[PDB]
Design an enzyme around this catalytic site. Structure first.
Site, PDB file in Angstrom:
ATOM      1  N   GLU A 268       3.836  -3.816 -16.073  1.00 54.54           N
ATOM      2  CA  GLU A 268       5.025  -4.241 -16.811  1.00 54.54           C
ATOM      3  C   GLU A 268       4.799  -5.453 -17.713  1.00 54.54           C
ATOM      4  OE1 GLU A 268       4.459  -4.399 -13.433  1.00 54.54           O
ATOM      5  OE2 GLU A 268       5.487  -6.149 -12.565  1.00 54.54           O
ATOM      6  N   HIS A 292      10.113   3.044 -14.316  1.00 55.20           N
ATOM      7  CA  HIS A 292       9.730   1.962 -13.421  1.00 55.20           C
ATOM      8  C   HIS A 292       9.311   0.716 -14.240  1.00 55.20           C
ATOM      9  CE1 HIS A 292       8.199   0.343  -9.636  1.00 55.20           C
ATOM     10  NE2 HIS A 292       7.303  -0.286 -10.397  1.00 55.20           N
ATOM     11  N   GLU A 293       8.406   0.901 -15.213  1.00 54.66           N
ATOM     12  CA  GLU A 293       7.932  -0.231 -16.015  1.00 54.66           C
ATOM     13  C   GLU A 293       9.069  -0.880 -16.829  1.00 54.66           C
ATOM     14  OE1 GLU A 293       5.345  -1.282 -14.723  1.00 54.66           O
ATOM     15  OE2 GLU A 293       4.687   0.638 -13.869  1.00 54.66           O
ATOM     16  N   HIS A 296      11.222  -3.145 -14.635  1.00 52.20           N
ATOM     17  CA  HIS A 296      10.619  -4.465 -14.380  1.00 52.20           C
ATOM     18  C   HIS A 296      11.032  -5.525 -15.419  1.00 52.20           C
ATOM     19  CE1 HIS A 296       8.004  -4.212 -10.945  1.00 52.20           C
ATOM     20  NE2 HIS A 296       7.263  -3.217 -11.422  1.00 52.20           N
ATOM     21  N   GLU A 315       9.173  -5.146  -6.431  1.00 52.96           N
ATOM     22  CA  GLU A 315       9.002  -3.690  -6.356  1.00 52.96           C
ATOM     23  C   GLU A 315      10.163  -2.887  -5.833  1.00 52.96           C
ATOM     24  OE1 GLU A 315       6.927  -2.399  -8.330  1.00 52.96           O
ATOM     25  OE2 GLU A 315       5.595  -4.113  -8.681  1.00 52.96           O
ATOM     26  N   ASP A 372      -5.046  -8.013  -3.478  1.00 48.95           N
ATOM     27  CA  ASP A 372      -5.532  -6.679  -3.862  1.00 48.95           C
ATOM     28  C   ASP A 372      -5.826  -5.780  -2.665  1.00 48.95           C
ATOM     29  OD1 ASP A 372      -5.332  -7.187  -6.594  1.00 48.95           O
ATOM     30  OD2 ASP A 372      -7.425  -7.851  -6.736  1.00 48.95           O
ATOM     31  N   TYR A 380       7.135  -1.203  -2.325  1.00 46.99           N
ATOM     32  CA  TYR A 380       7.880  -0.277  -3.171  1.00 46.99           C
ATOM     33  C   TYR A 380       8.874   0.524  -2.353  1.00 46.99           C
ATOM     34  CZ  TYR A 380       4.122  -0.907  -6.659  1.00 46.99           C
ATOM     35  OH  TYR A 380       3.227  -1.456  -7.538  1.00 46.99           O
TER      36      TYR A 380
HETATM   37  C1  LIG Z   1       0.843  -8.777  -3.745  1.00 49.41           C
HETATM   38  O1  LIG Z   1      -0.388  -8.332  -4.242  1.00 49.41           O
HETATM   39  C2  LIG Z   1      -0.443  -7.545  -5.361  1.00 49.41           C
HETATM   40  C3  LIG Z   1      -1.639  -7.015  -5.793  1.00 49.41           C
HETATM   41  C4  LIG Z   1      -1.710  -6.216  -6.908  1.00 49.41           C
HETATM   42  C5  LIG Z   1      -0.567  -5.946  -7.623  1.00 49.41           C
HETATM   43  C6  LIG Z   1      -0.475  -5.062  -8.840  1.00 49.41           C
HETATM   44  N1  LIG Z   1      -1.332  -4.992  -9.961  1.00 49.41           N
HETATM   45  N2  LIG Z   1      -0.752  -4.059 -10.711  1.00 49.41           N
HETATM   46  N3  LIG Z   1       0.332  -3.607 -10.125  1.00 49.41           N
HETATM   47  C7  LIG Z   1       1.217  -2.589 -10.661  1.00 49.41           C
HETATM   48  C8  LIG Z   1       2.195  -3.192 -11.690  1.00 49.41           C
HETATM   49  N4  LIG Z   1       3.158  -4.135 -11.154  1.00 49.41           N
HETATM   50  N5  LIG Z   1       0.465  -4.251  -9.003  1.00 49.41           N
HETATM   51  C9  LIG Z   1       0.616  -6.508  -7.179  1.00 49.41           C
HETATM   52  C10 LIG Z   1       0.691  -7.303  -6.069  1.00 49.41           C
HETATM   53 ZN   LIG Z   2       6.096  -2.028 -10.129  1.00 48.82          ZN
END
Ligand SMILES: COc1ccc(-c2nnn(CCN)n2)cc1
Ligand SMILES: [Zn+2]
Ligand SMILES: [Yb+3]
Ligand SMILES: [Yb+3]
EC number: 3.3.2.6
Length: 607
Positions: A268, A292-293, A296, A315, A372, A380
């Protein structure tokens, strides 16, 4: 306290603005320049401050036109290294200064993927893209790398003249670089305060096509036409989202379709959403990712989680809004179908981690956890389930949407916790506190596993999926003859995907059943990424050797983690493909996205 950041917290000092001047060098795989941070002291007699950095080379720090003392601390694994800056003059409360940091990134920056021409569609030019969420902005530039701090930004990016730069900001013109005629300078302005995980950059051989009054689609030339068609519902979705969340404050809503190694379905980035090319199904069936995007732009970008422990706020509310958009476009029965599908994905995530795993809690504790590694469907779907349960408890969607709009209005441009959200929910629904007090808050927010209560779901569109899946699961060898291509005639692509999701939850099925399914349904011919992914996982888990080259090809030809990680894992779990899965990862590792490479490695137990 933000436990993922090593920088001075928002109670000490706050970055108000970033002026970024940088140059992209594809031969060295470095971004070099200056990050001028306008910092406001929040304390009396402030004499030093700390910033987050990760694999950055610092040349100098300049304040008041003079170089100042700084020191980089020992590296703290995935958090990077803290950078302490000695201020030349003590600051009083609310005083602002500008700190200009001259830096250079490492080719191994976890925020960036550097692509060779062979890795792009056009085969002539290299490509670069960033992905800062959650804590990778520190791998591009020194910053307070926490969503608890929001700043505006301006940027000037020098790139080879044959290429185009785009950012998560409004485009503010291009000129030949006055310092080098072989280069162009692209300018950007982000006037709305954002958390730094929302800073994004792409540089490549990009072309655009207008698809709406405030939307251009960007991609390499080869994907422009297909992308303009796939995402044609964007404007209609933005109009519904404005009705639900209030004004769209960002100006533009552009879309960028990245190369296949883009690790997520969507990101997003404000003014410029990033999407995986795996959405290009040819029939707009994967458009919920755009919904979804878009969502955000309110839940996450305007109202932001204070720390990553409260990521479900971002989320959960976004999935809730996304499902209302799709429900407005396609009907309430469709919203329930997607909501029920989401519950199924939550069941899968809970089963994968285990019902007592701390990553299945709605509010997580990320102390000494790489965000990560903790990332999953839990925030979500458990977040969505909580909001959908509250909607039913509180009088329905119209009533709950009134709360959603008031919540966005109340917390716009702020960073909040679960306690701030709950306090506002109680304030808004003060006349329904008796009902709110019946919610098992400790279980919903802080306990692992499936939620304590499952919402009520309309089954209309799901019934045919469950009935066909059950026929296959209960079928014996003598029933296989009864299946035929006609079984699918009344199923939408969404329902075919749900039929596969239902069946995959009971995998393995006998090898003869999976062979019959290909014989009558020809699922090998389906290019829709969601359906193909579930079909290949079903084949591999049911031990079909013929699926091995298909699954290896999908796992490597694209890099969306949702697909790549479970495909590699299923291939490693199948004895016949185990060695091939490990060898394929080893061969592709160096050319993969840095985060995807790390995660696949951990999943495969390959160091
Ligand atoms: C809490 O830890 C994290 C780790 C990675 C992400 C992450 N990177 N890309 N997205 C999708 C778009 N929002 N989510 C988010 C939160
Ligand atoms: Zn998202
Ligand atoms: Yb301008
Ligand atoms: Yb039988």
């Amino acid at each position: 306290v933000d436990t993922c950041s090593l920088a001075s917290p928002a109670s000490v000092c706050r970055t108000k603005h970033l002026h970024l001047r940088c140059s992209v060098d594809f031969t060295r795989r470095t971004l070099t320049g200056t990050a001028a941070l306008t910092v406001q002291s929040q304390e009396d007699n402030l004499r030093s401050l700390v910033l987050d950095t990760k694999d950055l080379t610092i040349e100098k720090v300049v304040i008041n036109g003079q170089e100042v003392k700084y020191a980089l601390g020992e590296r703290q694994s995935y958090k990077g290294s803290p950078m302490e800056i000695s201020l030349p003059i003590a600051l009083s409360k609310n005083q602002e200064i500008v700190i200009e940091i001259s830096f250079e990134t490492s080719p191994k920056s976890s925020a960036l993927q550097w692509l060779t021409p062979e890795q792009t569609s056009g085969k002539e030019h290299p490509y670069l893209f960033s992905q800062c969420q959650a804590i990778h902005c520190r791998a591009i530039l020194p910053c307070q790398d926490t969503p608890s701090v929001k700043l505006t930004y301006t940027a000037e990016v020098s790139v080879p003249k044959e290429l185009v730069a785009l950012m998560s900001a409004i485009r503010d013109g291009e000129t030949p670089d006055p310092e080098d005629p072989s280069r162009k300078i692209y300018k950007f302005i982000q006037k709305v305060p954002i958390p730094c995980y929302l800073i994004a950059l792409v540089v490549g051989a990009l072309e655009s096509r207008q698809i709406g009054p405030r939307t251009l689609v960007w991609s390499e030339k080869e994907q422009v036409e297909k992308s303009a068609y796939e995402f044609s519902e964007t404007e209609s979705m933005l109009k519904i989202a404005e009705d639900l969340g209030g004004p769209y404050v960002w100006g533009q809503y552009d879309l960028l379709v990245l190369p296949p190694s883009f690790p997520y379905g969507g990101m997003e980035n404000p003014c410029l959403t990033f999407v995986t090319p795996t959405l290009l199904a040819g029939d707009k069936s994967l458009s919920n990712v755009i919904a979804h995007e878009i969502s955000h732009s309110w839940t996450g970008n305007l109202v932001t989680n204070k720390t990553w422990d409260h990521f479900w706020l971002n989320e959960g509310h976004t999935v809730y809004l996304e499902r209302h958009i799709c429900g407005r476009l396609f009907g309430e029965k469709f919203r329930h179908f997607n909501a029920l599908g989401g519950w199924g994905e939550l069941q899968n995530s809970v089963k994968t981690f285990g019902e007592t795993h701390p990553f299945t809690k709605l509010v997580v504790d990320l102390t000494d956890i790489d965000p990560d590694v903790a990332y999953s469907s839990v925030p979500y779907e458990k977040g969505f389930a909580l909001l959908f349960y509250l909607e039913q408890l509180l009088g329905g969607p119209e009533i709950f949407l009134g709360f959603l709009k008031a919540y966005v209005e109340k917390f716009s441009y702020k960073s909040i916790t679960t306690d701030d959200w709950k306090d506002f929910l109680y304030s808004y629904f003060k006349d329904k506190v008796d009902v709110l007090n019946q919610v098992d808050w400790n279980a919903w927010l802080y306990s692992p596993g499936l939620p304590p209560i499952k919402p009520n779901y309309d089954m209309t569109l799901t019934n045919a999926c469950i009935a066909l899946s059950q026929r296959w699961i209960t079928a014996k060898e003598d029933d296989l003859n009864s299946f035929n291509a006609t079984d699918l005639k009344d199923l939408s692509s969404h329902q075919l995907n749900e039929f596969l999701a239902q069946t995959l939850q009971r995998a393995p099925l006998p090898l003869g059943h999976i062979k019959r399914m290909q014989e009558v349904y020809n699922f090998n011919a389906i290019n829709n990424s969601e359906i193909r992914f579930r079909w290949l996982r079903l084949c591999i888990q049911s031990k079909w050797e013929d699926a091995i080259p298909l699954a290896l090809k999908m796992a490597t030809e694209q890099g969306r983690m949702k697909f790549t990680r479970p495909l590699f894992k299923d291939l490693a779990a199948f004895d016949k493909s185990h060695d091939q899965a490990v060898r394929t990862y080893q061969e592709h590792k160096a050319s993969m996205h840095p985060v995807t490479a790390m995660l696949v490695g951990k999943d495969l137990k390959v160091d």
